[PDB]
């Protein structure tokens, strides 16, 4: 159920996205919304059914008496953090949030910053919680950093308000 | 636009990678927090009610 | 977090003792073409009531024994003490 | 629990920590995952003698819990690996207090099933200390 | 029930417990659960799931009152520098209060880091000297409100117990 | 499939592929026959080129139709077409073959772009005006719309009711070899 | 299957054995089955209740509040919801201050209630 | 079907069952009282010495150069166009040759045998003397297939598609990892199969058996957390 | 909740919506009101019957596909695995205990 | 509601979460159970009654079963 | 295929049809003849001239099916009763409407 709740917040911000945007950039916008979020939540979605398919329950609290080897877990570590990054925006994927807020409605705007993104920091943080890596995080804290960095020194070339306040 | 400029952008990555590396080269020899995923609460989140029913 | 943690299981390698009889009991079957051809040496040798001293069943089992322990050798050698790979390499 | 007494202590309740080695604790967490079945056999065990005879005018109320008394017979010899006896009746003379801790805390108490887990555990952790 | 992956690399797996031998690309959901993922993630595995989470919760209180003595020394530190002028602050600061800075520095205490590197000894360990302060306090009855949760029956036979407590303690001769 | 002291224990039905793939092929079907139902009710005539998906822009009623039979074709979450696809994964998952599961991602996304691409066709100056006349009035079908309209609860809250479906074909499925 | 009484006697088994294996009293039993060892289900029950009670108000109070307040100060510009409250009898404006605040206000005396445990008898 | 056979050997296995092994000595030895020519024919086992480098390389060889020529018989000459005037002069050729078929065959499959050849046998000497010892086999061949196979697209190809020879690269070192170096739908033994050397009786069998048996109820989660109905 | 009064509700709002979607008024044609809901409502109340005993049949379905699980897997080991100490005692079973036709 | 009456897990659940496991064992875990136990517990009631001859039999002996 | 007795059993030699009634009094007549003596094991020796009958009427897959038939049933009634089946079943079905929760802090394990 908390893979769904998940999934299910995509097709009213595309709606929102399509119907209610004045400007006419926006029907391009929300496509490479759908795209990037949807393959971000078919890497969650990989990731989820391995979990369910290796440990046939659905409770947080069974996954305390199964031990995952390291093969699954780097996998299960790797395909989480770049899905739930896609949403999430790191480095190499922010194309489409700065299309989206570009070109969308002003309330949407403040939705999809304000609260949307959030959703996948809390998932994240579930499954990075419920499962033993003993994988080294240098590559995740790298990607992690070279977003801040990338973002951070794109600033000073904005002329548009928006796509500054995306930026940041 | 420079070509060494823009040769070292394109290599950020790989030298924040090889300096997160070498600080956790520091780390375990002095038994620093490493960078890894540390498991200590077993599973158990952070303000999280745990009841029964019955 | 691993490192800290208490080790479930406990080798028997690393309780200070030999499993090299135990090996070689298990990696006799990778070379059982060597152990026969130097049984039939041995029952040739012995039928020969007069051979010649160049003649022995030395050979046979040179090839058996180096079958047995490149079966044999490596796997305990991994298991040891300051074995283990580098960090990167 | 893993508190000693101190002894001529100047106050009544002083204690001091201890820390298992690291084979008790292996030993213990391995009997504990391969001997579950058993102890989760008792909370069910314990339960159900009461649902049928927990009234004194039953025809068998006076047998009371002894057919869980097998299971808490192969709980023990779990977690002892068969070295020590069939019955918790031959455990040695370590841990035979903590045996009667149990049993007043399973059943004379009928305490939630995760303190008597604990003595249980003491009974063990005593008997792996003295032998080997 | 538990299921399992398939595995891909070939190695003998040699059982002397069981006396069989097995490999790793033909082992079954079972074999996998016993050859594979048999190994701990705790720091004391051979406790509980109800004891393990007294065990987490004690380990945090611990880090937050080590955290606590660091924080009294200095708010000591500061009434001296206020109390006593520096024609002699050194000196007494210098007397029993340098060393206690120094026992409770970076390595000992987590302070502001993201984590304290222990082992499951010294997470015992920790855990062990909370729980010595908290039998020190239970047997006196100073938890009440602060940190415990009694009914009113249960207050008066803490009160009576602590109280027979305190006449037994006054009674005895001085060591 | 484990044996003990020569006593079989299997936890593996055996059969839950078969019933996956008949549930993959029956939700096609279903979403298939949900979008030309949409096309049926109109003329058939102005539907040639891509471009032309913005003929679908004539009342709510369709418009919003066929968008949700796009996504669900395309194998949007809530929608029925997503379901199919999240239980092909999981079976390759619990069947270990995850080259089949990363060829099958690649053919989703590439898919659901080619898909969702035309969802920016839609869009249209004014409304269409694709519907048959008969006596002098434009010809609206009832018995199609009602079509339409159960086809469509099915698309937006069959993942409500797919357990019994499961259960349904499993049933079927386990006649295969018994 | 086999965990039943048929066939079991105290003969077979030594005293001391049925001594631990023995049932406790009638009171603990009692309290064993109903899992009454701690807490009442009378005391569950009024705690339910109690629950239902609370939020219904609570929800009940803080809609009217803000029912209320919204309708008595969306009347128009400021200049015109001036003169329709000068229109207004005093019973009406006092009204229309007083029982959005009081609605309000006892949410909130009712949370704090709620949140506060003054009823426990060891005082003085 | 089955992909590398010979390296996926269970050799334990296989002698434990007395199953034939892939790996046994298949060498012919010539004795005495034995005449000159069997002597030089017997040589013949050279070719079977799969421990021979220069006999690896050229295998190898053979089949990319075997590989170049088919997809140039299939895909590479039909798509190509030939100026009207060389087409003409070819046909001129044949007219005047007896077996002028032949010469234009070689003329036309020279280059993709020839380039077949060399990557086949570079590719052998790069797998085999650089990667053969790295410990993470699905990294090591991912890494190298898709550093070769940019370069050989940058080379073979225009150099400005090297990223889509990188991606090809990864693509078919996960599938030769999946199906060429691992064992799947091509399994030589049974799931959950062993082999006992113990000299246990079948009480203490049976007895360990049971024992797993209890151990393994635990693995059902109605059982582990005590939700099971009474019957 | 009953299933006769789902149906009920499930028919009597797919009239309103076919109603709306059709862009006709509702309260037009009101005597399809009751008849939708006498036919959802007879719909999914056999539909509640034939699952319920769809779970019947494939449960005893799968003590069958047990039995076929065991042999096949038998039938289905590599040459040299049948009088193996590992499987021997089983196949023997099946070949001799089971011989009892 | 009536839909999900025939499982005391949700209908969402049950379909995404018993991928290829028995249906048995999913709506009647205690007869799959005790079906999987049979010559189980007929080794357990000859261990029984041998133990009431007074004879103690090393092997079967772990074979309690409660449920 | 290939494993299963069911889809082998509906392989038949061209021309081959199966007399069911006389296939079925015999099976009813050898089964009467057996389960008046009761055995874990059944043994058809000690029923000789209903054993020589039934095999001389019934088709070897129709005697596999049921002798596999036979078997489960054994089997079943060993384990089970009317009484408490019908208790099981009531009681399954009377906990289907409430729902599951999760055993938090949890001892066996
Ligand atoms: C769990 C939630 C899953 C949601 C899945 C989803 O995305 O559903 C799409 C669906 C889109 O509905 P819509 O945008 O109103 O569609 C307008 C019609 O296409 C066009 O509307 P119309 O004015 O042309 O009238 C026709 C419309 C009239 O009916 C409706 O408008 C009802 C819509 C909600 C049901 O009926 C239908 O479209 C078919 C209704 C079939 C069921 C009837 C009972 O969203 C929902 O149903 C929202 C569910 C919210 C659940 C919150 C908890
Ligand atoms: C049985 C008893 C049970 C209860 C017991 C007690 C329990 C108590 C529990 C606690 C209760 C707390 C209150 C609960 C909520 C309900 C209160 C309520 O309804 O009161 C109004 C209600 C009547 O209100 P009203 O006369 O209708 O006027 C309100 C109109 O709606 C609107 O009037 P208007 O539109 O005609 O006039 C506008 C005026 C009306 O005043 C208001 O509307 C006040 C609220 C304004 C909110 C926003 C103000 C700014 C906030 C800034 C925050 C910091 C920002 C920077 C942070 C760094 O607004 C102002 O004057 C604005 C204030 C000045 C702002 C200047 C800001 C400058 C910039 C600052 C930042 C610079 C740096 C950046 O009160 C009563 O009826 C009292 C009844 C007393 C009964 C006694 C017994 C008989
Ligand atoms: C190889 C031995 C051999 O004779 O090779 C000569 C053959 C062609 O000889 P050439 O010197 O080009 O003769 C040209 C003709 O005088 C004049 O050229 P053409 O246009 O009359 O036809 C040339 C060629 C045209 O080649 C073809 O038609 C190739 C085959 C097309 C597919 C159908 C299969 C062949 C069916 C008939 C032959 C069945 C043989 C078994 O057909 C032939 O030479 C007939 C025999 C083909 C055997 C292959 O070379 C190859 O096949 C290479
Ligand atoms: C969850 C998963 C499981 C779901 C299970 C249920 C599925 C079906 C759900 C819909 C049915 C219930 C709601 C009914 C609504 C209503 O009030 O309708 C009245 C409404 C009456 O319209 P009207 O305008 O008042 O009538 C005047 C007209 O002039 C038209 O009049 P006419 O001159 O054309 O002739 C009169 C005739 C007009 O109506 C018809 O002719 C209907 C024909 C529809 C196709 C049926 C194919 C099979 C027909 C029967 C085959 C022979 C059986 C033996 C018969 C006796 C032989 C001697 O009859 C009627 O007007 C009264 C209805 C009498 C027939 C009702 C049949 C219901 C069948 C429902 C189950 C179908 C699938 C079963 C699968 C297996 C289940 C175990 O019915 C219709 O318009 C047709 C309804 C068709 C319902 C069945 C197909 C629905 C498919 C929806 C998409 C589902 C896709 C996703 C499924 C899986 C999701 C995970
Ligand atoms: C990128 C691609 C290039 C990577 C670097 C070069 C790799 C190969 C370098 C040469 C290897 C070599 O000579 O190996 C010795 C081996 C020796 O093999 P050999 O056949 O002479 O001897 C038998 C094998 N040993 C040594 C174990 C007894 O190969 C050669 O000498 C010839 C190799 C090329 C044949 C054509
Ligand atoms: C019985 C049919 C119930 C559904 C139809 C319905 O009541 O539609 C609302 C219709 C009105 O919708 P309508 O579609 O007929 O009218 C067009 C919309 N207005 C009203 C703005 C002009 O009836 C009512 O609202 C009256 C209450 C129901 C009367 C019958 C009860 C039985
Ligand atoms: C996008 C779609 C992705 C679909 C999922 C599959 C992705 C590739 C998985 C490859 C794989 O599983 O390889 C098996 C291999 C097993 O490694 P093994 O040798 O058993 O143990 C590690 C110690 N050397 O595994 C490994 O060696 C490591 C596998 C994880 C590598 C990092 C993550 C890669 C992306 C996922
Ligand atoms: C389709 C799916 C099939 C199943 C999945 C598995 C896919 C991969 C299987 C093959 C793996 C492979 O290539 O392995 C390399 C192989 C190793 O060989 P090895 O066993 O070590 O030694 C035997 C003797 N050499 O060594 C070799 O095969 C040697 C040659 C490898 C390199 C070939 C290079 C390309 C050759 C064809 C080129 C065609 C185009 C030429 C012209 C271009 C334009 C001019
Ligand atoms: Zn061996």
């Known amino acids: 159920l908390f893979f769904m709740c998940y999934e299910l917040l995509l097709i009213p911000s595309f709606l929102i996205v399509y119907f209610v945007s004045p400007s006419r950039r926006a029907i391009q916008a929300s496509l490479y919304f759908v795209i990037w979020t949807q393959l971000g939540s078919l890497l969650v979605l990989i990731a989820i059914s391995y979990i369910i398919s290796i440990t046939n329950t659905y409770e947080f609290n069974d996954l305390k008496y199964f031990n995952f080897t390291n093969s699954e877990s780097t996998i299960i570590i790797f395909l989480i953090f770049l899905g739930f990054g896609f949403k999430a925006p790191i480095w190499p994927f922010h194309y489409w949030l700065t299309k989206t807020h570009v070109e969308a409605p002003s309330g949407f705007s403040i939705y999809l910053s304000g609260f949307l993104v959030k959703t996948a920091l809390y998932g994240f943080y579930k499954f990075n919680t419920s499962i033993f890596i003993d994988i080294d995080s240098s590559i995740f804290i790298a990607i992690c950093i070279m977003g801040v960095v990338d973002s951070s020194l794109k600033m000073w070339g904005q002329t548009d308000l928006k796509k500054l306040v995306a930026y940041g | 636009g420079s070509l060494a400029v823009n040769v070292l952008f394109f290599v950020v990555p790989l030298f924040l990678w090889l300096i997160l590396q070498t600080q956790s080269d520091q780390s375990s020899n002095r038994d620093d927090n490493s960078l890894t995923f540390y498991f200590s609460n077993a599973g158990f989140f952070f303000f999280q009610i745990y009841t029964n029913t019955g | 977090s691993s490192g800290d943690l208490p080790s479930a299981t406990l080798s028997m390698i690393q309780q200070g003792q030999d499993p090299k009889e135990l090996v070689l009991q298990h990696c006799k079957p990778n070379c059982l073409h060597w152990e026969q051809k130097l049984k039939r040496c041995e029952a040739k040798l012995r039928e020969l009531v007069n051979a010649d001293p160049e003649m022995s069943c030395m050979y046979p089992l040179r090839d058996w024994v180096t079958c047995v322990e490149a079966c044999v050798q490596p796997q305990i050698i991994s298991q040891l003490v300051g074995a283990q790979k580098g960090r990167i390499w | ?132 | ?175 | 499939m484990s044996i003990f002291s020569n006593i079989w224990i299997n936890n593996d039905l055996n059969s839950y592929g078969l019933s996956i793939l008949l549930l993959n092929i029956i939700n096609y079907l279903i979403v298939f026959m949900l979008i030309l139902s949409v096309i049926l009710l109109t003329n058939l005539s102005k539907f040639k080129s891509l471009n032309q998906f913005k003929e679908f822009n004539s009342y709510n009623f369709i418009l919003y139709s066929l968008i949700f039979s796009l996504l669900s074709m395309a194998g949007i979450p809530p929608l029925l077409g997503f379901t199919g696809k999240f239980l092909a994964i999981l079976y390759s998952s619990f069947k270990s073959q995850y080259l089949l599961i990363l060829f099958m991602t690649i053919l989703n996304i590439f898919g659901m772009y080619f898909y969702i691409q035309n969802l920016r066709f839609v869009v249209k100056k004014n409304k269409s005006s694709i519907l048959n006349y008969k006596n002098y009035y434009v010809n609206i079908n009832y018995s199609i719309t009602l079509n339409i309209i159960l086809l469509n609860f099915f698309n937006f809250f069959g993942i409500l009711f797919l357990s019994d479906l499961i259960i349904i074909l499993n049933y079927i499925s386990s006649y295969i070899y018994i | ?124 | ?231 | 909740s009953s299933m006769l009064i789902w149906g009920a509700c499930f028919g009597l709002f797919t009239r309103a919506a076919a109603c709306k979607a059709s862009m006709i008024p509702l309260t037009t044609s009101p005597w399809k009101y009751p008849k939708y809901m006498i036919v959802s409502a007879v719909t999914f109340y056999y539909f509640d019957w034939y699952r319920r005993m769809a779970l019947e049949q494939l449960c005893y379905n799968e003590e069958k596909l047990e039995r076929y699980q065991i042999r096949a897997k038998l039938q289905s080991l590599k040459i040299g695995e049948e009088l193996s100490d590992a499987y021997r005692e089983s196949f023997f079973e099946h070949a001799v205990q089971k011989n009892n036709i | 509601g009536v839909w999900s009456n025939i499982h005391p897990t949700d209908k969402v659940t049950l379909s995404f979460a018993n991928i290829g496991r028995p249906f048995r064992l999913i709506y009647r875990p205690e007869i799959f159970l005790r079906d999987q136990q049979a010559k189980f517990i007929q080794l357990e009631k000859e261990h029984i009654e041998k133990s009431k001859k007074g004879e103690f039999v090393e092997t079967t002996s772990p074979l309690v079963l409660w449920n | 295929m290939e494993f299963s007795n069911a889809l082998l059993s509906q392989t038949k030699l061209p021309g081959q049809q199966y007399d069911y009634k006389r296939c079925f009094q015999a099976s009813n007549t050898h089964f009467e003849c057996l389960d008046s003596i009761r055995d874990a094991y059944d043994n058809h020796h000690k029923c000789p001239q209903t054993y020589q009958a039934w095999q001389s009427s019934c088709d070897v897959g129709i005697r596999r099916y049921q002798m596999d038939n036979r078997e489960q049933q054994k089997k079943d009634q060993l384990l089970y009763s009317k009484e408490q089946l019908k208790n099981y079943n009531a009681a399954k079905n009377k906990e289907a409407y409430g729902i599951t929760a999760p055993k938090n802090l949890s001892f066996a394990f």
């Open chain 7, 1 to 124: 299957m086999n965990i039943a009484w048929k066939e079991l006697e105290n003969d077979a088994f030594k005293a001391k054995d049925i001594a631990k294996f023995s049932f406790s009293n009638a009171s603990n039993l009692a309290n064993f089955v109903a899992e009454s060892q701690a807490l009442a289900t009378n005391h569950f029950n009024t705690a339910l209740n109690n629950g239902f009670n609370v939020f219904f108000a609570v929800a009940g109070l803080l809609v009217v509040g803000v029912l209320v307040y919204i309708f008595f100060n969306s009347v128009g510009g400021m200049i015109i919801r001036s003169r329709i409250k000068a229109a207004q009898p005093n019973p009406n404006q006092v009204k229309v201050l007083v029982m959005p605040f009081v609605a309000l206000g006892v949410s909130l005396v009712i949370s704090r209630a709620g949140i506060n445990g003054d009823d426990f008898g060891y005082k003085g």
């Open chain 4, 1 to 132: 629990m893993f508190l000693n007494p101190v002894k001529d202590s100047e106050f009544d309740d002083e204690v001091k920590g201890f820390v298992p080695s690291e084979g008790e604790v292996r030993f213990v967490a391995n009997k504990n995952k391969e001997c579950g079945y058993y102890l989760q056999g008792i909370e069910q065990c314990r339960r159900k003698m009461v649902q049928l005879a927990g009234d004194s005018s039953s025809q068998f109320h006076s047998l009371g819990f002894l057919p869980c008394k097998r299971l808490v017979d192969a709980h023990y010899r779990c977690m002892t690996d068969d070295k020590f006896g069939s019955t918790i009746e031959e455990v040695p003379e370590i841990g035979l207090d903590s045996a009667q801790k149990f049993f007043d805390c399973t059943f004379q108490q009928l305490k939630p099933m995760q303190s008597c887990r604990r003595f249980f555990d003491q009974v063990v952790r005593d008997v792996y200390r003295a032998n080997g």
């Open chain 5, 1 to 175: 029930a538990f299921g399992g992956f398939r595995q891909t690399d070939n190695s003998l797996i040699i059982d002397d417990r069981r006396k069989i031998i097995l490999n790793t690309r033909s082992l079954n959901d079972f074999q996998q659960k016993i050859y594979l993922r048999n190994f701990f993630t705790n720091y004391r595995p051979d406790l509980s799931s109800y004891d393990y989470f007294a065990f987490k919760e004690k380990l945090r209180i611990g880090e937050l009152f080590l955290n606590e003595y660091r924080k009294r020394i200095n708010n000591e530190v500061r009434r001296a520098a206020i109390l006593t002028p520096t024609s002699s602050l050194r000196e007494k600061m210098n007397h029993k209060i340098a060393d206690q800075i120094l026992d409770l520095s970076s390595p000992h205490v987590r302070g502001a880091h993201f984590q304290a590197v222990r082992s499951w000894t010294d997470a015992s360990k920790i855990v062990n000297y909370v729980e010595e302060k908290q039998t020190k306090i239970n047997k006196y009855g100073l938890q009440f409100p602060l940190l415990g949760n009694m009914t009113e029956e249960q207050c008066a036979s803490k009160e009576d117990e602590v109280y027979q407590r305190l006449l037994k303690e006054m009674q005895k001769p001085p060591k």
């Open chain 8, 1 to 231: 079907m089955e992909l590398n056979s010979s390296a996926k050997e269970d050799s334990h296995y296989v002698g434990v069952l007395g199953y034939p092994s892939q790996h046994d000595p298949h060498t012919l030895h010539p004795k005495k009282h034995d005449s000159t020519f069997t002597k030089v024919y017997a040589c013949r086992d050279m070719l079977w010495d799969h421990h021979w480098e220069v006999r690896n390389t050229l295998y190898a060889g053979f089949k990319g150069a075997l590989l170049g020529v088919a997809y140039a018989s299939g895909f590479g000459l039909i798509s190509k166009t030939v100026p009207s005037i060389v087409l003409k002069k070819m046909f001129r050729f044949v007219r005047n040759n007896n077996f002028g078929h032949i010469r234009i065959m070689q003329d036309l499959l020279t280059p993709y045998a020839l380039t077949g050849f060399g990557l086949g046998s570079v590719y052998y000497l790069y797998q085999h003397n650089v990667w053969e010892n790295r410990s993470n086999k699905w990294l090591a061949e991912v890494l190298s297939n898709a550093l070769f196979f940019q370069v050989a697209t940058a080379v073979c190809v225009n150099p400005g598609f090297h990223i889509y020879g990188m991606v090809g690269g990864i693509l078919f070192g996960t599938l030769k990892y999946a199906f060429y170096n691992s064992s799947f739908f091509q399994e030589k033994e049974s799931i959950g199969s062993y082999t006992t050397f113990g000299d246990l009786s079948e009480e203490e069998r049976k007895k360990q058996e049971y024992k797993d048996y209890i151990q393994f109820l635990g693995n059902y989660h109605k059982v582990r957390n005590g939700q099971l109905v009474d019957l």
